[PDB]
Write a structure and sequence with these properties.
part of a larger assembly, 9 chains, A alpha+beta (about 230), B alpha+beta (about 240), C alpha+beta (about 200), D alpha+beta (about 240), E alpha+beta (about 240), F alpha+beta (about 240), G mainly alpha (about 140), H alpha+beta (about 240), I alpha+beta (about 250), B: alpha+beta, Glutamine Phosphoribosylpyrophosphate, subunit 1, domain 1, six-stranded antiparallel beta sheet, five-stranded antiparallel beta sheet, 6 helices, G: mainly alpha, about 40% helix, Probable proteasome subunit alpha type-7 (chain B), cytoplasm (chain B), mRNA binding (chain B)
Chain lengths: ~230, ~240, ~200, ~240, ~240, ~240, ~140, ~240, ~250
């Protein structure tokens, strides 16, 4: 249960941790699985959407902020709007002032700098949203893992969500495999689909449950949904 | 009365602020990071811990650069140090804009310390939980300062924070005693690698990854850059030789 | 330059040499047709080893000198000892944005133990440059022929003062807006010394 | 966090009344008593200053009756410090009304302005309500004499006879029996003096601790004469009332 | 009380956790999505027979092509409805076209996450999240007839058939098997009346429930009392068939 | 309730508890200093405690020169001391700019005391954790020593003590001042007052000093500076050979 | 502590007696004394001094490999399977303190028994992880 | 300045401040209003605890917002006249902006909106008043009676009462008033309103104030000498039957 | 960021009395025992300077100050609070009268204006009431000599003779017999010296007594000669030498 030191975000535990941030990270854990991975020349996101009931819909867990970038969701939906809007503002500012497409690492730095100022000052709350930024710049394909704590790191692949982290082992066993795969988007997407399948517990993958995005040089950022994703099922 | 640690600006009966102490205790739960003040410049070093192998090697970095001659290496709450170094970069940019002289190291220290303490005066701001080993080379020479979350900074001849903070300082003292007249940067980088290896022995359970960087006048002529190529490997296997 | 406001003009000049830099000016302040003060001073001590002279509107020059004094004292109090380029920097930054209102020409020169003596001039626009010598003011428009040919590098103190008088004599005699006594400042490793000339001697040559 | 030290001044109680104005209405009872009687010929305002001693200055000293306009005067019951700001704002508002309309400000307008000032603090801002209640007296061509009262809550009602302060109930009960609709100024004055004598906590009634303000209209028509009874004239009515 | 925008150990924010269950204290609003349009119905719940049926309006029209129902506490949605109408009309002015229903819902649900103290970086003020859930319904030229659910948590769903409020669990269960993609508008109205009757407190008439409709040609329309009465009679005929 | 002791609010005994606890924070460094007033100059001497060998002795000091004429010695945690030094330097700048003449010590002390009082009165602010000793020579008034406090109570002193043993040094100097009946040292040379202060400090603390244990600040006529280590060693040698 | 109203002056007797037995005139220097407190911020300064308890060993929350070692140790008696990935389970638990892992093992066994399985699997362990954790409420997947 | 939120969602879903304002209203003076074919009557009582309150300068319980629409309140009297001032200034602004005299529906919507905003804005407690709005729209003879709650919910009532003992007046109106057959005369409406009041006021003919609103900019306030006239035959017809 | 303490820190207790006001009164009643009495031809305000440490200089500390060359101020509470109060009061008095009217305000309006600040302090959120009690003495050409006492609550009372501090009860209960209708300045200063004699607990001399007098317009201290309109400041303060002459006059 909540303790005395919960209060507001500006408060240190005697052990030396922020309970607000920890609660944000737990809410990150509670969300659905959105495993993603990248190759030398391609970046693939795989998302498992959730429906309230049979007569319901699915959340767009894949948000596009530019043609050379993309986003994934692992938590609170409304704050994802704010985060995506900020990322789009900075991408458009880069386009209009520098002409340079925003570097993926620079995007992660901006996102962490934004996420800080709620946890640093009174009146703010941490962004309980987990971004898996993908993109491709002149350097190469990149992938990040954003956290409400402000921690941002670049990885070949990861999975944030309910029992999603149980699907990291599939990536780790095949980490040496999908890295050396270049210019082969369909099979990389197939490997990603195999990765998420390990995180299934009750219901299998269907047409309306799989949302897939992929970016690259020859392949711009494209979101797959509906019948367009059944070929990879 | 109880609750003397709930708020920030409250003084304890013995006169010691309590949120700052908890921030200090949060600092120690961080990756070790040392810095050596060689004769011509400074040599930083970090021990970014390799998590599950999904993390890409040699890509995530922690030695942030300010201007050209000031380097920042931080431990503890990494994002908080990110924001601190961001404000420091803004201050250096303003100084160079309205003075057109590169910011001297003690001036940067004063600016960062004044910013840090500004966050431990109020009740509506959490004190920083990051300790920095920022330093570099200026006109008058070389300086290496460690900043603490209480806002106190000192002109160290070498410092280290992290899990292996205590072990690192012993080897720092041994290095200082072994070379009282001074130390060259070339040997300083190898000594820094050795010190980090000795400190990492506490965290031998998890894998390590070493990144090092140095600012100097003899070679880098006041420019800050990392260590790449055969020099890093030479330092690594020299430090592994004695093991 | 407004209508009726007090302006300095005249001539200011500073020459570098081996032991430092000697900076010169006059004591005449001509306001339009009239001469208001003939014993005034155009030399401003922004720092012990950093000196600046004033040209243009009197009030504007005095105000910018006061602001530069404030900023320089802040710098020496907190950060460290100043230098010539910092003194020129604060002047340029003060003059730049308000160039529509503030319109004056400033020359700053200081001596240091590392780079010896340097001279930095701020024209009306507000740029900064480093020169062995520099002139400013309406009265300075006439000696362009003399000083450039008679200037030498790494001279000595006696030759520098001889050149300064042999250059300001034409400034005083050829323009009525410049006159009165001739004021000298010497910046060397020994220290700052104040020297003043008289109208009856440099005219007699 | 700047929360634990907040007292939540503007908070509704579980049953549903405010609590700060509730205690302000208790602070009112601990202040000096005041009396206001509405007579046909004029209005009499009297108050008994609290904390009186031989060293209290009486030559030029008015702490309960204040002048806001040549026609309108008020009686203060409560914390004089908080009443000072309200008095200044009322005077400013009256002078602004004279600025805008060039005609004497009716009492109701000023009473509303002060009630609104009190209500604004009782509503928002998180500040403690003013712990002062006023007694308003004035004249105009609209309704003739007017005698309102104020509260820390900011509500005002008209009264033919009021007494706010210590022993309010006793004073009201005493005055209600003797109040008619046809007194002159002198009858109201003697009634108020008798009420103050019968409600005071001391033994005798000395002229030092009594203040009087009266509104009279004589030969001159359209302008009443506002006189703050000085001690030299104050000691005169004591023998007329028989208290001496 | 302690904290306003504070999180919880379970990881869901407060207020919105309370607001998500405060809707059940309100009325019952039911909508059904058909290829021929969307049928909406509410529960007036006159606290006394002295109330007026035409007084309390729990169904509003954001636009000719978009209308919504109401549930929970009604007062807070007035700000929601004003902002939604302003957004729709401003989009029409800016882009000389009707605003897409999903975009309008998105532009509405963002307001549900503005509670906070001392907003920094921009001037935005709100004490608590709105405690009202809306059923956005309308037609568009790209997807067709839509029925959304403007939750107070900032999230929204496209819904084929939804009940919110008191019957959010009782009526919703019946909608699972009573809905099909071949449902017609007439049978949709009959089913809505039947489900309301099942969830009715008192007898159902033109004074106790108010219905509406959205169509591609007729647009938004509030059903009159006479047609509601004949719908009641038709439902009465339908229920007792065998 | 019990929230009285947390913020600067009055207490059943009529006391400001937070300001009271602020004083206990001034003795954290346990650094003892004293300042005497010469016939024409002033000298302030403070213990210079370097905890670790990694410290650079030059940068660690509790003596800050406020301006070319006003010096200041501050006791307490250093970061708050540096904040106070920054504000004092900025305010000396502002006064010199606005009024055109160098300010006397009393004006600066009064302004800092007023700032500390504003800190105490405002609830959202916390009081300064330092005790500042302003020392200077005033051609308008004479040599002067001014000591403020976190509360804002400032008053000129014939001779100031501080630290954990402030009372003992106070009595040690008071015996001399009450036997000699003079309000200042009669030694004309700034050379002699330094040895006088060092001798009294040594007899008071009962300790013997080296080149690095004590830092001495001297304020002559229109000049303030900090003596280097060789100067202190020469003074100690002179004291040792003289007595 | 000093107090004139009232105090716990009885327990302080035992505290000072323990202090005098640890150090003072009697040592005997052959009686080592271990002490395992939980709140070191409350202990009297005298009891924390040297001469008395000297070594102050800090017990931190288990490291990443430490969690795997703990799970391996506490899953010996139970009939485990041969496909349990201890590394994955150890990573799943984050700031889990000791007995919070034994509780995980017990809950996984209990879930496996409840579902009728004759031996635990990785799924039962994950379900136990969710059971023990701050998801003790769980349920309600609303709005993620 | 003050940014702290005062209205916080309770764990059971209600807002504690709003439901406390409900009780704050429940302690106010009883105010009742009924409407006929072309007449609406707003009846109200006054406090009888203290006497010697004059009538001329005593603020009327029913405050005139405009020539065609009037307002009556119950509960905290301090806060209600602020709503009265805001409604009046908003009505003048509406006249300036739309060149049309205000309607009852629009004014009631505005009052509900301002109460809703105060329940929404931070640092401000909700109003402790409940208001009744009555009047006639321009060029229309239909009386409209509107009730506004501190929670912000407004509704039309053929006959509604608020304040203390409002349950008794409500049940009385539930049987001696017909919604489908309203009284046809001003006298009948006044008689019904008066007879409703004696069920609670139980003497106090001096402090019973009644305002009768008529179309075509006709708002009157019946004096005591007429109210006691109605009371005469009302009490005469009470006990004998 | 700003100031998050926008709420009032003074809250009405259920007993009906202000907490912080009744707490500042307690903080005032302990401390330096000051006094001031009014005579026919002038007003004398006296206080004792409790030298905290004997190495300090009581000369640097000004226990009494000059609000205006006619009006002086004496306090009995907390030092820094009184200093800030006196600076603010001088500033606002200048702003209100020297800028607008052209001369120095009289005592009656100046006292109300300075008490405005304190009565705002007990009202404005996030701040605590001033812990000082002010004794204001002044003269004017119409109301004559007047002495005013300002309490931390902001209430000011006109008093012919007063005393605030530890010895307030004894001095107040002893001043009635001392005082009568007709008095002289030397008589008043002797009365004040006799009253303060027992209330002092340290060394008694000219250095430990801070004494000021408002009397006739002395032209020597005016600082210029040639204007018959003004004749000098009426507020003068005795030095140690001045006061140790009437000290043995007892």
């Amino acid at each position: 249960f909540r303790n005395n030191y919960d209060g507001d975000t500006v408060t240190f535990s005697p052990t030396g941790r922020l309970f607000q941030v920890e609660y944000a990270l737990e809410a990150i854990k509670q969300g659905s699985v959105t495993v993603g991975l990248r190759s030398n020349t391609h970046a693939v996101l795989v998302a498992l959407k959730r429906n309230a009931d049979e007569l319901s819909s699915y959340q767009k867990k894949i948000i596009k902020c530019d043609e050379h970038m993309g986003l994934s969701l692992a938590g609170l939906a409304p704050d994802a709007r704010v985060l995506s809007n900020y990322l789009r503002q900075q991408c458009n500012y880069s386009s209009l002032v520098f002409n340079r497409k925003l570097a993926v690492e620079r995007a992660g730095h901006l996102l962490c700098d934004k996420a800080q100022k709620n946890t640093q000052s009174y009146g703010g709350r941490p962004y309980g949203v987990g971004l898996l930024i993908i993109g491709y710049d002149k350097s190469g394909a990149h992938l990040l893992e954003f956290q409400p704590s402000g921690n941002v790191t670049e990885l070949y692949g990861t999975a944030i969500g309910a029992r999603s982290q149980g699907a990291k082992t599939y990536l780790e066993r095949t980490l040496d495999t999908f890295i050396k795969i270049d210019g082969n988007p369909d099979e990389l997407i197939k490997a990603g689909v195999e990765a998420i399948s390990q995180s299934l517990r009750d219901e299998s993958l269907t047409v309306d449950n799989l949302s897939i995005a992929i970016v690259g040089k020859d392949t711009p950022f494209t979101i797959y949904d509906g019948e367009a994703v059944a070929k990879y099922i | 009365g109880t609750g003397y640690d709930l708020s920030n600006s409250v003084f304890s009966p013995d006169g010691r602020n309590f949120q700052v102490e908890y921030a200090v205790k949060a600092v120690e739960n961080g990756t070790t990071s040392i810095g050596i003040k060689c004769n011509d410049g400074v040599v930083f070093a970090v021990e970014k811990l390799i998590t599950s192998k999904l993390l890409v090697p040699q890509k995530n970095v922690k030695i942030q650069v300010v201007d050209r001659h000031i380097g920042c290496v931080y431990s503890g709450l990494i994002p908080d140090g990110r924001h601190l170094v961001n404000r420091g970069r803004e201050e250096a940019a303003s100084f160079k804009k309205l003075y057109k002289t590169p910011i001297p190291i003690p001036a940067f220290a004063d600016r960062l310390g004044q910013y840090v303490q500004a966050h431990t005066l109020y009740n509506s701001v959490r004190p920083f939980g990051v300790s920095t080993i920022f330093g570099g080379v200026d006109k008058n020479g070389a300086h290496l300062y460690m900043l603490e979350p209480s806002g106190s900074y000192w002109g160290y001849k070498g410092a280290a924070t992290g899990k292996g903070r205590q072990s690192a300082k012993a080897e720092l003292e041994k290095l200082v005693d072994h070379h009282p007249e001074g130390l060259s940067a070339r040997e300083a980088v190898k000594q820094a690698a050795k010190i980090i290896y000795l400190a990492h022995e506490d965290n031998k359970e998890k894998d390590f990854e070493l990144e090092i960087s140095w600012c100097s006048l003899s070679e880098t002529n006041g420019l800050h850059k990392f260590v790449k190529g055969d020099l890093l490997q030479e330092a690594i296997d020299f430090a592994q030789k004695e093991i | 330059l407004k209508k009726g406001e007090v302006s300095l003009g005249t001539s200011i000049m500073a020459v570098t040499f081996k032991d430092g830099v000697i900076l010169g000016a006059d004591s005449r302040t001509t306001t339009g047709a009239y001469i208001a003060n003939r014993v005034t001073d155009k030399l401003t001590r922004v720092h012990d080893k950093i000196w600046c002279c004033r040209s243009g509107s009197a009030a504007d020059t005095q105000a910018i000198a006061d602001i530069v004094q404030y900023h320089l004292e802040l710098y020496t109090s907190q950060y460290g000892t100043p230098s010539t380029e910092t003194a020129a920097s604060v002047f340029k930054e003060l003059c730049y944005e308000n160039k529509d209102n503030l319109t004056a020409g400033i020359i700053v020169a200081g001596y240091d133990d590392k780079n010896k003596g340097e001279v930095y001039t701020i024209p009306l626009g507000g740029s900064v440059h480093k020169l062995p010598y520099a002139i400013a003011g309406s009265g300075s428009t006439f000696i362009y022929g003399y000083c450039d040919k008679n200037f030498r590098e790494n001279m000595s103190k006696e030759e520098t003062v001889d050149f300064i008088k042999h250059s300001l004599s034409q400034a005083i005699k050829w323009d009525g807006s410049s006159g009165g006594v001739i004021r000298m400042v010497v910046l060397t490793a020994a220290g700052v010394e104040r020297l003043i000339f008289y109208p009856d001697e440099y005219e007699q040559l | 966090g700047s929360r634990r030290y907040d007292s939540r001044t503007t908070i509704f109680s579980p049953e549903g009344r405010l609590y700060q104005v509730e205690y302000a209405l208790e602070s009112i009872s601990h202040a000096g008593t005041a009396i206001g009687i509405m007579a046909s010929d004029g209005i009499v305002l009297a108050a008994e200053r609290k904390v009186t001693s031989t060293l209290l200055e009486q030559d030029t000293s008015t702490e309960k009756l204040y002048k806001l306009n040549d026609k309108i005067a008020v009686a203060v019951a409560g914390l004089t410090a908080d009443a000072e700001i309200l008095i200044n704002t009322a005077r400013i508002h009256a002078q602004n009304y004279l600025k805008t309309y060039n005609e004497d400000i009716p009492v109701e307008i000023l009473v509303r302005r002060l009630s609104d000032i009190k209500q604004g603090y009782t509503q928002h801002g998180g500040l403690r309500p003013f712990g002062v209640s006023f007694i308003y007296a004035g004249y105009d061509d609209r309704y003739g004499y007017q005698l309102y009262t104020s509260n820390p809550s900011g509500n005002y009602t008209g009264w033919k006879a009021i007494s706010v302060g210590a022993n309010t109930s006793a004073a009201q009960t005493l005055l209600q029996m003797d109040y008619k609709d046809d007194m002159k100024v002198d009858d109201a004055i003697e009634l108020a003096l008798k009420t103050l004598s019968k409600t005071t906590d001391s033994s005798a009634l000395t002229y030092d601790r009594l203040e009087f303000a009266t509104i009279r209209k004589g030969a001159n028509d359209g302008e009443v004469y506002q006189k703050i009874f000085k001690p030299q004239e104050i000691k005169d009515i004591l023998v007329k009332t028989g208290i001496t | 009380d302690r904290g306003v925008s504070t999180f919880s150990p379970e990881g869901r924010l407060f207020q919105v956790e309370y607001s998500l269950e405060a809707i059940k204290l309100g009325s019952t609003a039911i909508g059904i999505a058909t290829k021929e349009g969307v049928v909406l119905g509410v529960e007036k719940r006159a606290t006394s027979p002295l109330l007026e049926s035409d007084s309390i309006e729990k169904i509003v029209e954001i636009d000719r092509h978009i209308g919504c129902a109401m549930s929970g506490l009604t007062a807070d949605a007035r700000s929601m409805i004003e902002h939604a109408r302003t957004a729709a009309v401003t989009h029409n002015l800016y882009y000389d076209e009707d605003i897409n229903v999903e975009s309008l819902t998105q532009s509405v649900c963002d307001l549900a996450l503005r509670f906070g103290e001392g907003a920094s970086g921009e001037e935005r003020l709100m004490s608590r999240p709105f405690g009202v859930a809306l059923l956005i319904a309308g037609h568009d030229a790209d997807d067709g007839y839509q029925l959304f659910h403007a939750e107070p948590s900032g999230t929204f769903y496209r819904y084929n058939a939804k009940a919110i409020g008191s019957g959010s669990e009782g009526a919703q269960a019946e909608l699972l098997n009573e809905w099909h993609s071949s449902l017609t508008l007439k049978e949709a109205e009959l089913l809505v009346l039947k489900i309301l009757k099942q969830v009715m407190e008192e007898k159902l008439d033109e004074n106790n429930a108010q219905l509406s409709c959205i169509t591609k040609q007729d647009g938004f329309k509030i059903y009159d009392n006479e047609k509601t009465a004949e719908l009641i009679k038709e439902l009465k005929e339908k229920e007792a068939a065998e | 309730a019990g929230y009285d002791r947390h913020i600067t609010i009055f207490s059943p005994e009529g006391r400001l508890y937070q300001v009271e606890y602020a004083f206990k924070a001034t003795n954290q460094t346990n650094i003892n200093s004293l300042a005497v007033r010469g016939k024409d100059c002033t000298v302030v001497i403070s213990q210079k405690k370097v905890p670790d060998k990694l410290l650079d002795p030059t940068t660690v000091s509790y003596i800050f020169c406020i301006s070319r004429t006003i010096g200041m010695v501050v006791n307490g945690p250093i970061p708050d001391a540096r904040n106070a030094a920054l504000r004092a330097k900025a305010e000396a700048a502002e006064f010199r700019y606005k009024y055109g003449y160098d300010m006397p010590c009393d004006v600066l002390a009064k302004r800092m005391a007023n700032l500390s009082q504003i800190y105490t009165q405002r609830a959202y602010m916390r009081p300064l954790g330092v005790i500042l000793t302003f020392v200077s020579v005033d051609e308008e008034l004479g040599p002067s020593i001014y000591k403020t406090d976190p509360a804002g109570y400032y008053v000129g002193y014939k001779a100031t003590a501080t630290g954990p043993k402030q009372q003992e040094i106070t009595t040690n100097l008071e015996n001399h001042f009450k036997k000699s009946k003079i309000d200042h040292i009669n030694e004309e040379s700034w050379e002699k007052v330094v040895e006088f202060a060092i001798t009294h400090m040594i007899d008071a603390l009962g300790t013997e000093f080296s080149k690095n244990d004590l830092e001495v600040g001297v304020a002559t006529k229109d000049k303030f500076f900090t003596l280097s280590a060789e100067n202190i060693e020469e003074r100690l040698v002179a004291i040792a050979e003289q007595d | 502590f000093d107090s004139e109203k009232s105090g716990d002056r009885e327990v302080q007797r035992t505290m000072l007696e323990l202090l005098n037995q640890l150090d003072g005139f009697s040592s005997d220097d052959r009686v080592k004394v271990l002490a395992a407190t939980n709140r070191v911020d409350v202990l009297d300064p005298a009891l924390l001094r040297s001469g008395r308890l000297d070594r102050k060993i800090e017990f931190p929350l288990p490291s990443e490999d430490s969690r795997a070692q703990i799970l391996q140790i506490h899953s010996r008696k139970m009939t485990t399977d041969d496909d349990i990935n201890w590394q994955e389970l150890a990573r799943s638990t984050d700031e889990f303190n000791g007995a919070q892992l034994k509780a995980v093992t017990v809950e996984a066994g209990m879930i496996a028994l409840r579902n009728g399985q004759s031996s635990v699997k990785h799924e039962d362990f994950v379900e136990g992880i969710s059971e023990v954790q701050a998801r003790k409420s769980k349920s309600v997947s609303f709005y993620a | 300045g003050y940014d702290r939120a005062l209205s916080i969602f309770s764990p059971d879903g209600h807002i504690f401040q709003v439901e406390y304002a409900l009780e704050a209203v429940k302690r106010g003076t009883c105010a009742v209003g009924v409407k006929g074919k072309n007449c609406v009557v707003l009846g109200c009582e006054r406090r009888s605890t203290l006497k010697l309150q004059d009538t001329r300068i005593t603020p009327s319980k029913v405050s005139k917002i405009d020539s065609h629409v009037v307002l009556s309140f119950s509960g905290l009297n301090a806060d209600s006249r602020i709503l009265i001032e805001k409604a009046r200034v908003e009505a003048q602004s509406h006249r300036l902006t739309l060149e049309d005299p205000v309607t009852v529906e629009y004014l009631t919507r505005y009052v509900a909106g301002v109460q809703q905003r105060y329940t929404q804005s931070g640092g401000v407690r909700p109003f402790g008043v409940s208001t009744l709005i009555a009047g006639f729209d321009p060029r229309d003879d239909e009386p409209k009676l509107y009730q506004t709650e501190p929670s912000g919910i407004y509704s039309s009532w053929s006959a509604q009462t608020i304040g203390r003992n409002s349950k008794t007046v409500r049940e009385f109106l539930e049987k001696n008033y017909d919604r489908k057959e309203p009284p046809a005369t001003v006298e009948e409406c006044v008689k019904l309103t008066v007879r409703s009041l004696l069920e609670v006021v139980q003497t106090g003919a001096k402090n019973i104030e009644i305002t009768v609103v008529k179309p075509d900019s006709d708002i009157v306030a019946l004096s005591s000498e007429e109210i006691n006239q109605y009371v005469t035959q009302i009490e005469q017809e009470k006990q004998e039957q | 960021m700003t100031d998050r303490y926008s709420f009032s820190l003074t809250t009405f207790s259920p007993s009906g009395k202000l907490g912080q006001i009744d707490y500042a009164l307690t903080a005032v009643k302990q401390g330096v025992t000051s006094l001031g009495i009014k005579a026919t031809n002038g007003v004398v305000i006296a206080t004792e300077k409790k030298s905290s440490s004997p190495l300090a200089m009581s000369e640097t500390l000004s226990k009494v100050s000059l609000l205006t060359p006619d009006i002086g101020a004496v306090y009995s509470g907390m030092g820094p609070d009184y200093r800030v109060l006196v600076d603010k009061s001088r500033k606002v008095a200048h702003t209100s009268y020297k800028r607008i009217y052209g001369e120095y305000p009289p005592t009656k309006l100046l006292v109300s204006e300075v008490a405005k600040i304190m009565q705002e302090a007990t009202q404005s959120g996030g701040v605590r009431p001033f812990g000082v009690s002010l004794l204001i003495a002044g003269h004017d050409e119409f109301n004559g000599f007047s002495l005013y006492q300002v309490d931390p609550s902001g209430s000011y009372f006109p008093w012919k003779a007063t005393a605030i501090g530890k010895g307030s009860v004894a001095a107040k209960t002893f001043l009635e017999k001392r005082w009568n209708d007709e008095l002289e300045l030397e008589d008043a200063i002797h009365i004040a010296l006799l009253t303060l004699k027992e209330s002092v607990e340290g060394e008694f001399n000219g250095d430990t007594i801070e004494l000021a007098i408002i009397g006739d317009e002395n032209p020597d201290l005016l600082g210029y000669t040639g204007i018959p309109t003004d004749k000098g400041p009426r507020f003068r303060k005795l030095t140690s030498q001045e006061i140790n002459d009437r000290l043995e006059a007892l």
